Design a protein around this nucleic acid. Structure first.
Lengths: 22, 102
RNA sequence: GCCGUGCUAAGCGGGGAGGUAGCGGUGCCCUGUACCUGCAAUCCGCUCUAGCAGGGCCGAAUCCCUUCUCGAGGUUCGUUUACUUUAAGGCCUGCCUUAAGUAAGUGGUGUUGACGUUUGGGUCCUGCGCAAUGGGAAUUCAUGAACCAUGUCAGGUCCGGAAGGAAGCAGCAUUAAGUGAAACCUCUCAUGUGCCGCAGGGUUGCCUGGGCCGAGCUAACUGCUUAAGUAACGCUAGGGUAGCGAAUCGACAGAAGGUGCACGGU
């Protein structure tokens, strides 16, 4: 579960870096 | 908060090749979106500098960050202002997506 | 006149008071029963005198009239005595509100000598003055600031080929802003902190208690005494009423006197 959470966080960070419309 | 946002960009640089995930291991392209363009980033990465300039209080409660606080954060990161305002909007949509799923 | 047989008048309750100009009755009362009916109270029928109308009984008389005596009662006036109602008049009397003084019953306090002798505690109000110590600060230690103090600012960021600069966050001092801990030294306000400084009000007008010496004051509730104040309960006038008296009308009982005619016989 912890690993999954970490992965999700990473994905979110990547998205933020990319930038995207609201 | 911003301490967590930097950690996500820091771990992305630590574990990311060709913007993986996005078929980094084959490496041709490879960008997972396609794409790429990077997609992120030479500016999203700076994102680290804006959260670094914030105080412990400002990080825990981002709703307290207004005009007088923003102007201070921008001067300490050597930014403005539109680049930082972009990072916070993106983070707001992230927590909305986090609470809705997991 | 003496006898026989009839009739009339009178009578078939009265009285008192009021009323009416009286005189009567109906009504009210006093004595008794003593015929019936229509009328009579805004009185009514009368006015001499008789109750108007009508009917029945008795008749000259022990039973018709008159008078004296007796006296049931009506009325009126006055006194002595009892009860009721109403009002003045006042220290007889109830009661407001009371002045002075004293005695005993009780408390108390202080007016005179308050001398004098004792003591404890307390008071205790005004006004000012002050220190105290009771509170509020400097002060002090601790702590102590993402963005709008500061000192020291690792690490990221920028200018740059370099030498050198830029933006200055985390953190950590000190200091702003603060925060916490207690208390000398420092300011400020003051309560039996002291009544310590004093004045006025009593410096003895007191407060309290106890042992005291003759008057005192007060509850003057009770006593005696003297002087004021309201009026009726208990006091005095008028009215009514009973035991009293005078006047005047009068049932009843009783005494003394007076009251007709017809015929027949003689």
């Amino acid at each position: 579960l912890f690993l999954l959470t970490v992965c999700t966080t990473v994905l979110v960070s990547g998205w933020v870096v990319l930038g995207w419309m609201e | 908060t911003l301490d967590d946002f930097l950690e996500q960009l820091g771990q992305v640089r630590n574990m990311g090749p060709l913007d993986e995930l996005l078929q980094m291991m084959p490496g041709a392209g490879k960008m997972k979106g396609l794409k790429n363009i990077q997609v992120d980033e030479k500016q999203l990465n700076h994102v680290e500098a804006i959260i670094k300039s914030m105080t412990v209080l400002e990080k825990e409660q981002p709703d307290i960050i207004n005009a007088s606080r923003r102007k201070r954060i921008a001067k300490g990161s050597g930014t403005s202002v539109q680049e930082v305002n972009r990072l916070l909007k993106q983070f707001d949509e992230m927590k909305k997506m986090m609470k809705q799923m997991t």
